[PDB]
Amino acid sequence: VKASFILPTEDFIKEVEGERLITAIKHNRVDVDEKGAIGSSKEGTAQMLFSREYATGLYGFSIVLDL
RNA sequence: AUUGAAAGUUGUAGUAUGCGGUCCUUGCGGCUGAGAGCACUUCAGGAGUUGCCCGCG
């Protein structure tokens, strides 16, 4: 089984050319204290703030099966 | 079947929690659509005319 890379189609890129089409979003993992506190790490970060990037577009694929 | 062959950059994670666009406020006071004004002035229902005609309780 041969699998190629997943690339967005070239006409879509040519038409769009601009715009990031990549959105960076922040998620927080909550670790509260024993009774009700958010912990001694302060609320500058809730407990932690990590970041994730999400893409968007029309992609092309090609798969070969030599069964 | 190519220095290629086997291969997750993988798994778990809430920007969340409480926070009144709030309390007081006259569209308010005074103000003649009023005073003057002939549906008035001239005017015949008017001029002609046999209850008509015959009569033995």
PDB file of all heavy atoms in Angstrom, chain B residues 9-21:
ATOM      1  P     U B   9       3.620  10.743  11.937  1.00  0.00           P
ATOM      2  OP1   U B   9       2.737  10.786  10.746  1.00  0.00           O
ATOM      3  OP2   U B   9       4.882   9.967  11.879  1.00  0.00           O
ATOM      4  O5'   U B   9       3.972  12.241  12.348  1.00  0.00           O
ATOM      5  C5'   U B   9       4.950  12.517  13.346  1.00  0.00           C
ATOM      6  C4'   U B   9       4.366  12.476  14.737  1.00  0.00           C
ATOM      7  O4'   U B   9       5.432  12.700  15.702  1.00  0.00           O
ATOM      8  C3'   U B   9       3.299  13.526  15.033  1.00  0.00           C
ATOM      9  O3'   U B   9       2.352  12.994  15.958  1.00  0.00           O
ATOM     10  C2'   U B   9       4.100  14.631  15.710  1.00  0.00           C
ATOM     11  O2'   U B   9       3.341  15.479  16.546  1.00  0.00           O
ATOM     12  C1'   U B   9       5.121  13.824  16.503  1.00  0.00           C
ATOM     13  N1    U B   9       6.368  14.550  16.777  1.00  0.00           N
ATOM     14  C2    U B   9       6.646  14.875  18.088  1.00  0.00           C
ATOM     15  O2    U B   9       5.906  14.583  19.012  1.00  0.00           O
ATOM     16  N3    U B   9       7.823  15.555  18.278  1.00  0.00           N
ATOM     17  C4    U B   9       8.727  15.933  17.306  1.00  0.00           C
ATOM     18  O4    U B   9       9.746  16.543  17.633  1.00  0.00           O
ATOM     19  C5    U B   9       8.366  15.559  15.973  1.00  0.00           C
ATOM     20  C6    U B   9       7.225  14.898  15.761  1.00  0.00           C
ATOM     21  P     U B  10       0.851  13.569  16.002  1.00  0.00           P
ATOM     22  OP1   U B  10       0.201  13.248  14.707  1.00  0.00           O
ATOM     23  OP2   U B  10       0.910  14.978  16.465  1.00  0.00           O
ATOM     24  O5'   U B  10       0.139  12.710  17.139  1.00  0.00           O
ATOM     25  C5'   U B  10      -0.429  11.442  16.846  1.00  0.00           C
ATOM     26  C4'   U B  10      -0.226  10.470  17.979  1.00  0.00           C
ATOM     27  O4'   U B  10       1.189  10.354  18.276  1.00  0.00           O
ATOM     28  C3'   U B  10      -0.854  10.852  19.309  1.00  0.00           C
ATOM     29  O3'   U B  10      -2.231  10.529  19.373  1.00  0.00           O
ATOM     30  C2'   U B  10      -0.005  10.083  20.313  1.00  0.00           C
ATOM     31  O2'   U B  10      -0.408   8.724  20.375  1.00  0.00           O
ATOM     32  C1'   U B  10       1.376  10.148  19.659  1.00  0.00           C
ATOM     33  N1    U B  10       2.203  11.253  20.195  1.00  0.00           N
ATOM     34  C2    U B  10       2.868  11.034  21.385  1.00  0.00           C
ATOM     35  O2    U B  10       2.796   9.984  21.999  1.00  0.00           O
ATOM     36  N3    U B  10       3.620  12.091  21.831  1.00  0.00           N
ATOM     37  C4    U B  10       3.772  13.317  21.220  1.00  0.00           C
ATOM     38  O4    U B  10       4.486  14.171  21.747  1.00  0.00           O
ATOM     39  C5    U B  10       3.054  13.465  19.992  1.00  0.00           C
ATOM     40  C6    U B  10       2.314  12.452  19.532  1.00  0.00           C
ATOM     41  P     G B  11      -3.332  11.690  19.513  1.00  0.00           P
ATOM     42  OP1   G B  11      -4.329  11.515  18.428  1.00  0.00           O
ATOM     43  OP2   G B  11      -2.615  12.982  19.649  1.00  0.00           O
ATOM     44  O5'   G B  11      -4.049  11.372  20.899  1.00  0.00           O
ATOM     45  C5'   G B  11      -4.505  10.062  21.200  1.00  0.00           C
ATOM     46  C4'   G B  11      -3.942   9.574  22.511  1.00  0.00           C
ATOM     47  O4'   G B  11      -2.494   9.539  22.429  1.00  0.00           O
ATOM     48  C3'   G B  11      -4.225  10.452  23.720  1.00  0.00           C
ATOM     49  O3'   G B  11      -5.502  10.213  24.284  1.00  0.00           O
ATOM     50  C2'   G B  11      -3.073  10.116  24.656  1.00  0.00           C
ATOM     51  O2'   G B  11      -3.309   8.882  25.317  1.00  0.00           O
ATOM     52  C1'   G B  11      -1.929   9.920  23.665  1.00  0.00           C
ATOM     53  N9    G B  11      -1.159  11.160  23.453  1.00  0.00           N
ATOM     54  C8    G B  11      -1.493  12.210  22.632  1.00  0.00           C
ATOM     55  N7    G B  11      -0.616  13.174  22.650  1.00  0.00           N
ATOM     56  C5    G B  11       0.355  12.736  23.537  1.00  0.00           C
ATOM     57  C6    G B  11       1.554  13.360  23.964  1.00  0.00           C
ATOM     58  O6    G B  11       2.010  14.460  23.630  1.00  0.00           O
ATOM     59  N1    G B  11       2.244  12.568  24.872  1.00  0.00           N
ATOM     60  C2    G B  11       1.837  11.336  25.315  1.00  0.00           C
ATOM     61  N2    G B  11       2.646  10.729  26.193  1.00  0.00           N
ATOM     62  N3    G B  11       0.722  10.742  24.927  1.00  0.00           N
ATOM     63  C4    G B  11       0.034  11.495  24.045  1.00  0.00           C
ATOM     64  P     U B  12      -6.738  11.167  23.914  1.00  0.00           P
ATOM     65  OP1   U B  12      -7.913  10.305  23.637  1.00  0.00           O
ATOM     66  OP2   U B  12      -6.280  12.133  22.883  1.00  0.00           O
ATOM     67  O5'   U B  12      -7.014  11.985  25.252  1.00  0.00           O
ATOM     68  C5'   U B  12      -7.468  11.331  26.428  1.00  0.00           C
ATOM     69  C4'   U B  12      -6.962  12.020  27.669  1.00  0.00           C
ATOM     70  O4'   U B  12      -5.515  11.926  27.722  1.00  0.00           O
ATOM     71  C3'   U B  12      -7.240  13.514  27.758  1.00  0.00           C
ATOM     72  O3'   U B  12      -8.543  13.805  28.227  1.00  0.00           O
ATOM     73  C2'   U B  12      -6.136  14.006  28.682  1.00  0.00           C
ATOM     74  O2'   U B  12      -6.458  13.730  30.037  1.00  0.00           O
ATOM     75  C1'   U B  12      -4.971  13.106  28.270  1.00  0.00           C
ATOM     76  N1    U B  12      -4.108  13.741  27.251  1.00  0.00           N
ATOM     77  C2    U B  12      -3.177  14.667  27.677  1.00  0.00           C
ATOM     78  O2    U B  12      -3.042  14.982  28.846  1.00  0.00           O
ATOM     79  N3    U B  12      -2.407  15.214  26.681  1.00  0.00           N
ATOM     80  C4    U B  12      -2.473  14.932  25.333  1.00  0.00           C
ATOM     81  O4    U B  12      -1.710  15.509  24.556  1.00  0.00           O
ATOM     82  C5    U B  12      -3.459  13.962  24.971  1.00  0.00           C
ATOM     83  C6    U B  12      -4.222  13.413  25.920  1.00  0.00           C
ATOM     84  P     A B  13      -9.360  15.045  27.617  1.00  0.00           P
ATOM     85  OP1   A B  13     -10.759  14.961  28.105  1.00  0.00           O
ATOM     86  OP2   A B  13      -9.088  15.096  26.160  1.00  0.00           O
ATOM     87  O5'   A B  13      -8.680  16.323  28.281  1.00  0.00           O
ATOM     88  C5'   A B  13      -8.871  16.625  29.660  1.00  0.00           C
ATOM     89  C4'   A B  13      -8.340  17.994  30.009  1.00  0.00           C
ATOM     90  O4'   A B  13      -6.927  18.051  29.673  1.00  0.00           O
ATOM     91  C3'   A B  13      -9.000  19.158  29.273  1.00  0.00           C
ATOM     92  O3'   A B  13      -9.032  20.308  30.119  1.00  0.00           O
ATOM     93  C2'   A B  13      -8.042  19.408  28.113  1.00  0.00           C
ATOM     94  O2'   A B  13      -8.086  20.716  27.588  1.00  0.00           O
ATOM     95  C1'   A B  13      -6.693  19.101  28.754  1.00  0.00           C
ATOM     96  N9    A B  13      -5.680  18.646  27.801  1.00  0.00           N
ATOM     97  C8    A B  13      -5.833  17.712  26.809  1.00  0.00           C
ATOM     98  N7    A B  13      -4.748  17.504  26.106  1.00  0.00           N
ATOM     99  C5    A B  13      -3.816  18.359  26.675  1.00  0.00           C
ATOM    100  C6    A B  13      -2.466  18.613  26.383  1.00  0.00           C
ATOM    101  N6    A B  13      -1.793  18.006  25.404  1.00  0.00           N
ATOM    102  N1    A B  13      -1.820  19.526  27.140  1.00  0.00           N
ATOM    103  C2    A B  13      -2.496  20.135  28.122  1.00  0.00           C
ATOM    104  N3    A B  13      -3.765  19.982  28.492  1.00  0.00           N
ATOM    105  C4    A B  13      -4.376  19.068  27.721  1.00  0.00           C
ATOM    106  P     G B  14     -10.344  20.647  30.985  1.00  0.00           P
ATOM    107  OP1   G B  14      -9.899  21.248  32.267  1.00  0.00           O
ATOM    108  OP2   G B  14     -11.206  19.439  31.003  1.00  0.00           O
ATOM    109  O5'   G B  14     -11.094  21.774  30.145  1.00  0.00           O
ATOM    110  C5'   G B  14     -11.620  21.494  28.851  1.00  0.00           C
ATOM    111  C4'   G B  14     -12.415  22.648  28.289  1.00  0.00           C
ATOM    112  O4'   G B  14     -13.640  22.820  29.056  1.00  0.00           O
ATOM    113  C3'   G B  14     -11.715  24.009  28.295  1.00  0.00           C
ATOM    114  O3'   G B  14     -12.104  24.736  27.129  1.00  0.00           O
ATOM    115  C2'   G B  14     -12.310  24.683  29.526  1.00  0.00           C
ATOM    116  O2'   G B  14     -12.265  26.093  29.503  1.00  0.00           O
ATOM    117  C1'   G B  14     -13.741  24.164  29.480  1.00  0.00           C
ATOM    118  N9    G B  14     -14.462  24.215  30.756  1.00  0.00           N
ATOM    119  C8    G B  14     -15.653  24.865  30.972  1.00  0.00           C
ATOM    120  N7    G B  14     -16.086  24.761  32.196  1.00  0.00           N
ATOM    121  C5    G B  14     -15.121  23.996  32.830  1.00  0.00           C
ATOM    122  C6    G B  14     -15.051  23.553  34.174  1.00  0.00           C
ATOM    123  O6    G B  14     -15.852  23.759  35.094  1.00  0.00           O
ATOM    124  N1    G B  14     -13.906  22.799  34.402  1.00  0.00           N
ATOM    125  C2    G B  14     -12.953  22.507  33.459  1.00  0.00           C
ATOM    126  N2    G B  14     -11.919  21.762  33.875  1.00  0.00           N
ATOM    127  N3    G B  14     -13.007  22.912  32.201  1.00  0.00           N
ATOM    128  C4    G B  14     -14.110  23.648  31.957  1.00  0.00           C
ATOM    129  P     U B  15     -11.070  25.736  26.412  1.00  0.00           P
ATOM    130  OP1   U B  15     -11.216  25.574  24.943  1.00  0.00           O
ATOM    131  OP2   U B  15      -9.742  25.538  27.040  1.00  0.00           O
ATOM    132  O5'   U B  15     -11.600  27.187  26.801  1.00  0.00           O
ATOM    133  C5'   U B  15     -10.700  28.211  27.216  1.00  0.00           C
ATOM    134  C4'   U B  15     -11.190  28.896  28.467  1.00  0.00           C
ATOM    135  O4'   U B  15     -10.054  29.351  29.254  1.00  0.00           O
ATOM    136  C3'   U B  15     -12.079  30.119  28.249  1.00  0.00           C
ATOM    137  O3'   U B  15     -13.086  30.157  29.259  1.00  0.00           O
ATOM    138  C2'   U B  15     -11.114  31.279  28.468  1.00  0.00           C
ATOM    139  O2'   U B  15     -11.727  32.488  28.862  1.00  0.00           O
ATOM    140  C1'   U B  15     -10.215  30.719  29.563  1.00  0.00           C
ATOM    141  N1    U B  15      -8.889  31.348  29.638  1.00  0.00           N
ATOM    142  C2    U B  15      -8.336  31.500  30.894  1.00  0.00           C
ATOM    143  O2    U B  15      -8.888  31.115  31.909  1.00  0.00           O
ATOM    144  N3    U B  15      -7.103  32.099  30.920  1.00  0.00           N
ATOM    145  C4    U B  15      -6.388  32.565  29.838  1.00  0.00           C
ATOM    146  O4    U B  15      -5.286  33.086  30.021  1.00  0.00           O
ATOM    147  C5    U B  15      -7.034  32.381  28.575  1.00  0.00           C
ATOM    148  C6    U B  15      -8.235  31.795  28.517  1.00  0.00           C
ATOM    149  P     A B  16     -14.638  30.145  28.851  1.00  0.00           P
ATOM    150  OP1   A B  16     -14.828  29.127  27.789  1.00  0.00           O
ATOM    151  OP2   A B  16     -15.064  31.546  28.612  1.00  0.00           O
ATOM    152  O5'   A B  16     -15.368  29.625  30.167  1.00  0.00           O
ATOM    153  C5'   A B  16     -15.210  28.285  30.603  1.00  0.00           C
ATOM    154  C4'   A B  16     -14.873  28.222  32.070  1.00  0.00           C
ATOM    155  O4'   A B  16     -13.458  28.467  32.263  1.00  0.00           O
ATOM    156  C3'   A B  16     -15.549  29.258  32.950  1.00  0.00           C
ATOM    157  O3'   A B  16     -16.880  28.910  33.287  1.00  0.00           O
ATOM    158  C2'   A B  16     -14.612  29.341  34.147  1.00  0.00           C
ATOM    159  O2'   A B  16     -14.826  28.249  35.029  1.00  0.00           O
ATOM    160  C1'   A B  16     -13.249  29.158  33.476  1.00  0.00           C
ATOM    161  N9    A B  16     -12.601  30.447  33.175  1.00  0.00           N
ATOM    162  C8    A B  16     -12.877  31.314  32.148  1.00  0.00           C
ATOM    163  N7    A B  16     -12.125  32.387  32.145  1.00  0.00           N
ATOM    164  C5    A B  16     -11.299  32.215  33.246  1.00  0.00           C
ATOM    165  C6    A B  16     -10.270  33.005  33.790  1.00  0.00           C
ATOM    166  N6    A B  16      -9.889  34.176  33.279  1.00  0.00           N
ATOM    167  N1    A B  16      -9.645  32.545  34.894  1.00  0.00           N
ATOM    168  C2    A B  16     -10.030  31.370  35.408  1.00  0.00           C
ATOM    169  N3    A B  16     -10.979  30.539  34.987  1.00  0.00           N
ATOM    170  C4    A B  16     -11.582  31.026  33.891  1.00  0.00           C
ATOM    171  P     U B  17     -18.020  30.040  33.340  1.00  0.00           P
ATOM    172  OP1   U B  17     -19.322  29.396  33.035  1.00  0.00           O
ATOM    173  OP2   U B  17     -17.565  31.196  32.529  1.00  0.00           O
ATOM    174  O5'   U B  17     -18.038  30.487  34.866  1.00  0.00           O
ATOM    175  C5'   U B  17     -18.264  29.534  35.894  1.00  0.00           C
ATOM    176  C4'   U B  17     -17.614  29.951  37.187  1.00  0.00           C
ATOM    177  O4'   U B  17     -16.174  29.971  37.033  1.00  0.00           O
ATOM    178  C3'   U B  17     -17.947  31.347  37.682  1.00  0.00           C
ATOM    179  O3'   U B  17     -19.207  31.419  38.321  1.00  0.00           O
ATOM    180  C2'   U B  17     -16.771  31.659  38.600  1.00  0.00           C
ATOM    181  O2'   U B  17     -16.944  31.033  39.861  1.00  0.00           O
ATOM    182  C1'   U B  17     -15.618  30.965  37.868  1.00  0.00           C
ATOM    183  N1    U B  17     -14.822  31.907  37.047  1.00  0.00           N
ATOM    184  C2    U B  17     -13.584  32.264  37.540  1.00  0.00           C
ATOM    185  O2    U B  17     -13.142  31.826  38.588  1.00  0.00           O
ATOM    186  N3    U B  17     -12.874  33.142  36.762  1.00  0.00           N
ATOM    187  C4    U B  17     -13.275  33.694  35.564  1.00  0.00           C
ATOM    188  O4    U B  17     -12.527  34.476  34.976  1.00  0.00           O
ATOM    189  C5    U B  17     -14.571  33.283  35.121  1.00  0.00           C
ATOM    190  C6    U B  17     -15.282  32.426  35.859  1.00  0.00           C
ATOM    191  P     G B  18     -20.481  31.977  37.519  1.00  0.00           P
ATOM    192  OP1   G B  18     -21.594  31.015  37.715  1.00  0.00           O
ATOM    193  OP2   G B  18     -20.047  32.329  36.144  1.00  0.00           O
ATOM    194  O5'   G B  18     -20.856  33.324  38.279  1.00  0.00           O
ATOM    195  C5'   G B  18     -21.530  33.283  39.525  1.00  0.00           C
ATOM    196  C4'   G B  18     -20.998  34.318  40.481  1.00  0.00           C
ATOM    197  O4'   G B  18     -19.554  34.211  40.574  1.00  0.00           O
ATOM    198  C3'   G B  18     -21.232  35.772  40.105  1.00  0.00           C
ATOM    199  O3'   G B  18     -22.567  36.192  40.368  1.00  0.00           O
ATOM    200  C2'   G B  18     -20.142  36.483  40.897  1.00  0.00           C
ATOM    201  O2'   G B  18     -20.488  36.565  42.272  1.00  0.00           O
ATOM    202  C1'   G B  18     -18.989  35.492  40.757  1.00  0.00           C
ATOM    203  N9    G B  18     -18.142  35.793  39.588  1.00  0.00           N
ATOM    204  C8    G B  18     -18.133  35.128  38.387  1.00  0.00           C
ATOM    205  N7    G B  18     -17.275  35.618  37.535  1.00  0.00           N
ATOM    206  C5    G B  18     -16.682  36.670  38.214  1.00  0.00           C
ATOM    207  C6    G B  18     -15.672  37.575  37.798  1.00  0.00           C
ATOM    208  O6    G B  18     -15.085  37.628  36.712  1.00  0.00           O
ATOM    209  N1    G B  18     -15.361  38.487  38.799  1.00  0.00           N
ATOM    210  C2    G B  18     -15.944  38.525  40.040  1.00  0.00           C
ATOM    211  N2    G B  18     -15.505  39.485  40.867  1.00  0.00           N
ATOM    212  N3    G B  18     -16.885  37.688  40.441  1.00  0.00           N
ATOM    213  C4    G B  18     -17.204  36.793  39.484  1.00  0.00           C
ATOM    214  P     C B  19     -22.946  37.685  40.844  1.00  0.00           P
ATOM    215  OP1   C B  19     -22.637  37.811  42.291  1.00  0.00           O
ATOM    216  OP2   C B  19     -24.330  37.945  40.377  1.00  0.00           O
ATOM    217  O5'   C B  19     -21.986  38.663  40.033  1.00  0.00           O
ATOM    218  C5'   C B  19     -21.431  39.807  40.676  1.00  0.00           C
ATOM    219  C4'   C B  19     -21.337  40.999  39.756  1.00  0.00           C
ATOM    220  O4'   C B  19     -20.113  40.912  38.979  1.00  0.00           O
ATOM    221  C3'   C B  19     -22.477  41.157  38.752  1.00  0.00           C
ATOM    222  O3'   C B  19     -22.771  42.542  38.584  1.00  0.00           O
ATOM    223  C2'   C B  19     -21.874  40.603  37.465  1.00  0.00           C
ATOM    224  O2'   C B  19     -22.450  41.116  36.283  1.00  0.00           O
ATOM    225  C1'   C B  19     -20.413  41.019  37.604  1.00  0.00           C
ATOM    226  N1    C B  19     -19.478  40.160  36.867  1.00  0.00           N
ATOM    227  C2    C B  19     -18.317  40.727  36.344  1.00  0.00           C
ATOM    228  O2    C B  19     -18.107  41.935  36.528  1.00  0.00           O
ATOM    229  N3    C B  19     -17.450  39.948  35.661  1.00  0.00           N
ATOM    230  C4    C B  19     -17.715  38.652  35.490  1.00  0.00           C
ATOM    231  N4    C B  19     -16.832  37.920  34.809  1.00  0.00           N
ATOM    232  C5    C B  19     -18.895  38.048  36.010  1.00  0.00           C
ATOM    233  C6    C B  19     -19.743  38.833  36.685  1.00  0.00           C
ATOM    234  P     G B  20     -23.787  43.275  39.588  1.00  0.00           P
ATOM    235  OP1   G B  20     -23.118  44.485  40.125  1.00  0.00           O
ATOM    236  OP2   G B  20     -24.315  42.250  40.522  1.00  0.00           O
ATOM    237  O5'   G B  20     -24.991  43.740  38.656  1.00  0.00           O
ATOM    238  C5'   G B  20     -25.680  42.806  37.831  1.00  0.00           C
ATOM    239  C4'   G B  20     -26.758  43.470  37.009  1.00  0.00           C
ATOM    240  O4'   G B  20     -27.788  43.989  37.895  1.00  0.00           O
ATOM    241  C3'   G B  20     -26.297  44.649  36.155  1.00  0.00           C
ATOM    242  O3'   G B  20     -27.047  44.677  34.942  1.00  0.00           O
ATOM    243  C2'   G B  20     -26.673  45.853  37.011  1.00  0.00           C
ATOM    244  O2'   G B  20     -26.865  47.051  36.289  1.00  0.00           O
ATOM    245  C1'   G B  20     -27.964  45.373  37.664  1.00  0.00           C
ATOM    246  N9    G B  20     -28.259  46.016  38.946  1.00  0.00           N
ATOM    247  C8    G B  20     -27.455  46.050  40.059  1.00  0.00           C
ATOM    248  N7    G B  20     -27.988  46.699  41.056  1.00  0.00           N
ATOM    249  C5    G B  20     -29.219  47.119  40.574  1.00  0.00           C
ATOM    250  C6    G B  20     -30.245  47.867  41.203  1.00  0.00           C
ATOM    251  O6    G B  20     -30.272  48.325  42.351  1.00  0.00           O
ATOM    252  N1    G B  20     -31.325  48.068  40.351  1.00  0.00           N
ATOM    253  C2    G B  20     -31.408  47.610  39.061  1.00  0.00           C
ATOM    254  N2    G B  20     -32.535  47.909  38.399  1.00  0.00           N
ATOM    255  N3    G B  20     -30.460  46.911  38.462  1.00  0.00           N
ATOM    256  C4    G B  20     -29.402  46.703  39.273  1.00  0.00           C
ATOM    257  P     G B  21     -26.314  44.394  33.543  1.00  0.00           P
ATOM    258  OP1   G B  21     -27.334  43.956  32.558  1.00  0.00           O
ATOM    259  OP2   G B  21     -25.143  43.526  33.821  1.00  0.00           O
ATOM    260  O5'   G B  21     -25.789  45.827  33.090  1.00  0.00           O
ATOM    261  C5'   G B  21     -26.645  46.729  32.399  1.00  0.00           C
ATOM    262  C4'   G B  21     -26.685  48.083  33.063  1.00  0.00           C
ATOM    263  O4'   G B  21     -25.444  48.789  32.788  1.00  0.00           O
ATOM    264  C3'   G B  21     -27.810  49.000  32.589  1.00  0.00           C
ATOM    265  O3'   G B  21     -28.264  49.804  33.674  1.00  0.00           O
ATOM    266  C2'   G B  21     -27.115  49.886  31.565  1.00  0.00           C
ATOM    267  O2'   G B  21     -27.732  51.139  31.364  1.00  0.00           O
ATOM    268  C1'   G B  21     -25.729  50.032  32.179  1.00  0.00           C
ATOM    269  N9    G B  21     -24.681  50.323  31.199  1.00  0.00           N
ATOM    270  C8    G B  21     -24.462  49.681  30.005  1.00  0.00           C
ATOM    271  N7    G B  21     -23.452  50.173  29.340  1.00  0.00           N
ATOM    272  C5    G B  21     -22.982  51.202  30.144  1.00  0.00           C
ATOM    273  C6    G B  21     -21.901  52.100  29.949  1.00  0.00           C
ATOM    274  O6    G B  21     -21.118  52.166  28.995  1.00  0.00           O
ATOM    275  N1    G B  21     -21.775  52.986  31.013  1.00  0.00           N
ATOM    276  C2    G B  21     -22.582  53.009  32.123  1.00  0.00           C
ATOM    277  N2    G B  21     -22.299  53.943  33.043  1.00  0.00           N
ATOM    278  N3    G B  21     -23.593  52.179  32.317  1.00  0.00           N
ATOM    279  C4    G B  21     -23.732  51.309  31.294  1.00  0.00           C
TER     280        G B  21
END
